[PDB]
Amino acid sequence: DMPVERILEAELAVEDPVTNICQAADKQLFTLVEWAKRIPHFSELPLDDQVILLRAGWNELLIASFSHRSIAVKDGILLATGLHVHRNSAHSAGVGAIFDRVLTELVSKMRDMQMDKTELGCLRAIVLFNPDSKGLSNPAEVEALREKVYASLEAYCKHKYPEQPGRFAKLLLRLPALRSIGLKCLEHLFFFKLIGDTPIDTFLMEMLEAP
Amino acid sequence: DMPVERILEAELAVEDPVTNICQAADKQLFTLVEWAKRIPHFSELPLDDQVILLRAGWNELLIASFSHRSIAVKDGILLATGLHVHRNSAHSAGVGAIFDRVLTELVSKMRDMQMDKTELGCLRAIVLFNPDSKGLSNPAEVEALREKVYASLEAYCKHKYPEQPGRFAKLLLRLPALRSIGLKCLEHLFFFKLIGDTPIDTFLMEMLEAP
Amino acid sequence: HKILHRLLQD
Amino acid sequence: HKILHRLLQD
Ligand SMILES: CCN(c1ccc(OCC(C)C)c(C(C)C)c1)c1ccc(C(=O)O)cn1
Ligand SMILES: CCN(c1ccc(OCC(C)C)c(C(C)C)c1)c1ccc(C(=O)O)cn1
C-alpha cells in the first residue's frame, strides 16, 4: 500500500547569489536523505538502489521543493537558508535564463493550480521511483512502486478535487518541464565546478562526481 | 471538441549511420508539417504560433515517431527512409549511448505496453500543444488545447483498456524521458553542425538555427 | 525560418 | 559516493 498520508508527512517532516544557491543545495541534500527514508517502501529497497535513485533524482527532487516553496513570493525563489534570490539578482549574476524558466514553468504554474503539499510529495515520490535509472538491480520493482504512487495520487485528486477531472494529468505534465530544467541546472553546476570560481560543498560536490 | 479519431487519422495519413539518420530527420520535418495540419484546431492558431510550436517540439515529435515505428525490431530503429540502424552500427559510429537510451526508455517501453497509434498521436499532440513555448501570443489557448487532448486520451484509455486503470498515467510518464532524450539529441545535432563533418540538409539546418 | 513558413501557408 | 552511503545506513 502507498498511502498519501505518509507521503505528506514526509514533506511536513522536512519542511554573488550563485554562492548562496549552491550552499542551500548542499544543505538540502542532507534533508533529501531524511525525506526519502520517510517515503513508504523506499528503505526496504537494496541499499545500492537507494543510492542510484537519489543520485539520479536529487536535482529534480530539490528543484520541485524550492519551486513549491517559492509560491509565497512572486518574483524570486525562497532558499531553504531563509534567503530570497530575486529575479534581478539572478539576472545580475548572469543566471537569469534558467531562473526565469523556474518561475514561469514551475513556480507560477504551481501557484496557478494551488498545488498542495500532498500533490507535491506524490510528484517527488514519482521522481524518486524512477525505473529508468541505470544500474537498478530490479527496475520492475521500482516501476511497481511508481505505479502505486500515481495510483494513490489520482485517487487523492479525484477525491479532494472532484471538480477538476484533468488535475491529475495536469500535475504529471509538469514533470517534463522539471526534467528539462533539471538538466540545465546540472550544466550550470558542472560549469561552476569546472571553472572553480564558486565554492561547492562536499555533498553537492559528491553528487556531481561521475558514476 | 478534440476527437481521437482525427488524431489517429493524422498518424495514419503520414505513416556512417549518422549521415543516414540526419537525412531521415530532414525528410520527416516535411512530413511533420503535414501531420500537424491534420491535428484538430492547430491550423486555426495564429501562423506565428504554429511556427513556435513546431520549432519547439519537432525534436520530441520526430523521436516519438521512429521510436514507436521501431517496435517491430528489437535491437535497432527503423528510419523513415526504409533503412535500419542497428545497435552495433550506432555503437560503431560513437553514438551508442543515446541510441541505447532510445531503445530502453522509449522503444522497449512502448513495446511492453503495446502502445497503439491512437495513444501515440495523442502524446504527440500533447507535445505539439506545449503552452510553455516561449513567444506564444496566447499560451492559455495552447494550454486549453493540450487539456482537450489528454482529456480525450484518458477517455480513450479507460474505454479501450478498462482493465488498466494506470495506463493513462503510464503514457504521460514517458514524456519526461522523451524530453531528456530530445535535449541530448539536440546536443548531438549541434555538435555535428559545429564540426561540419556530417552533411545536414536545409530543413534540418533551419530547425537548428537560433531563434 | 523560411522553409517552415512556406510549408505552413500552403 | 561516501556521504550518501553514510547517511542512508544510519
Ligand atoms: C537542485 C539544487 N538547487 C539548485 C542548484 C542550482 C540552481 O541554479 C543553478 C546555478 C544558477 C547555480 C538552482 C536554481 C537557482 C535554478 C537550484 C537547489 C538550491 C536550493 C534549494 C533549496 O533552497 O531548497 C534546493 N535546490
Ligand atoms: C529527431 C530527429 N531524428 C533524429 C536525429 C538524430 C538522432 O540521433 C542524433 C545523432 C546520433 C545524429 C536520432 C536518433 C538516432 C537518436 C534521431 C530523427 C531521425 C529519423 C527519424 C525518422 O526516420 O522518422 C525521425 N527523427
Furthest CA-CA distance within chain B: 51
Closest in A147, A165, A176 to B176, CB measured: A176
Residue with cell 488498466: B164
Ligand 2 centroid to residue B128 C-alpha, Å:
18
What value does the CA radius of gyration of chain D take, rounded to a whole number of Å? 5
Q: Residue A80 annotated as binding? A: yes
How far is residue A110's CA from residue A108's CA, in Å, rounded to a whole number? Answer: 5
Distance in angstroms (rounded) separating the CA atoms of residues B100 and B107 = 10
- Amino acid (one-letter) located at B166: G
CA distance A172 to A170: 6
Q: Are D4 and A47 in contact, with CB atoms under 8 Å apart?
A: no
Cβ within 8 Å, pair B150-A166: yes
How far from B117 is each of A22, A142, B161, CA to CA, in Å?
45, 27, 14
Partners of B172 in beta bridges: none
- State the DSSP string of chain B: ---HHHHHHHHHHH--HHHHHHHHHHHHHHHHHHHHHHSTTSTTS-HHHHHHHHHHHHHHHHHHHHHHHTTS-SSEEE-TTS-EEEHHHHHHTT-HHHHHHHIIIIIHHHHHHT--HHHHHHHHHHHHS-TT-TT-S-HHHHHHHHHHHHHHHHHHHHHH-TT-TTHHHHHHTTHHHHHHHHHHHHHHHHHHHHHT-S---HHHHHHTS--
C-alpha to C-alpha distance for A144 and A147, rounded to whole angstroms:
5
* Chain D positions in Cβ-Cβ contact with residue A201 (cut-off 8 Å): none
Q: What residue spans define the domains of chain B?
A: 1-211
- Return the C-alpha cell found at B70: 521501431
| Pairing assessment for the beta strands B76-78 and B84-86 based on DSSP bridges | antiparallel
Q: What is the dihedral of CA B45, B119, B31, C4, to 10 degrees?
A: 30
Our answer on whether B and D touch (3+ beta-carbon pairs < 8 Å) is no
Closest CA to B122 of B200, B47, B61: B61
Let me know: does B150 contact B126? Beta carbons within 8 Å.
Answer: yes
Distance between CA atoms of residues A199 and A20, nearest Å: 10
Judge contact between A23 and A56, C-beta under 8 A. Answer: no
Angle, helices B139-160/B117-128, rounded to nearest 10 degrees: 170
C-alpha distance across the termini of chain D, in Å: 15
Separation of alpha carbons B37 and B50, rounded Å: 10
Three-state DSSP string of chain A? CCCHHHHHHHHHHHCCHHHHHHHHHHHHHHHHHHHHHHCCCCCCCCHHHHHHHHHHHHHHHHHHHHHHHCCCCCCEEECCCCCEEEHHHHHHCCCHHHHHHHHHHHHHHHHHHCCCHHHHHHHHHHHHCCCCCCCCCCHHHHHHHHHHHHHHHHHHHHHHCCCCCCHHHHHHCCHHHHHHHHHHHHHHHHHHHHHCCCCCCHHHHHHCCCC
- Which residues, including other chains, have CB under 8 Å from residue A71's CB and lie 6 or more apart? A107, A110, A111, A115
Q: Which own/partner contact pairs does B42-47 have at CB distance under 8 Å and 24+ positions apart?
A: B42/B128, B42/B145, B45/B141, B45/B142, B46/B137, B46/B138, B47/C5, B47/C8, B47/C9
> Which residues form ligand 2's pocket by a CB distance below 6 Å?
B 18, 21-22, 24-25, 28, 59, 62-63, 65-66, 79-80, 95, 98-99, 102, 185, 188
Closest alpha carbon to A132 in B168, B172, B109? B109
Q: Where does residue A210 fall: left (phi above 0), alpha (psi -120 to 50 degrees), or beta otherwise?
A: beta
Q: Which three cell numbers stand for residue A129?
A: 521511483
Q: Is B196 left (phi over 0), alpha (psi -120 to 50) or beta?
A: left
- Burial of residue A79 (CB within 10 Å: 0-12, 13-18, 19+) is buried
Do B176 and B109 touch, CB atoms closer than 8 A?
no
Residue B171 CA, chain-centre distance (Å), reads 14
Residue that the C-alpha cell 478498462 belongs to: B162
Query: How far does B77 lie from chain C, in Å, by closest CA?
Result: 26
Distance CA B116, CA C9 (A): 31
Kindly give the distance from the C-alpha atom of residue B46 to the centroid of ligand 1, in angstroms, as a whole number.
Answer: 36
What are A's interface residues with B at a Cβ cutoff of 8 A?
104-105, 126, 132, 146-147, 150-151, 154, 165-166, 168-170, 172-173, 175-180, 183
Method: X-ray
Indicate the DSSP class of residue D10: -
- Write out the three cell numbers for B58: 519537432
The resolution in Å comes to 2.4
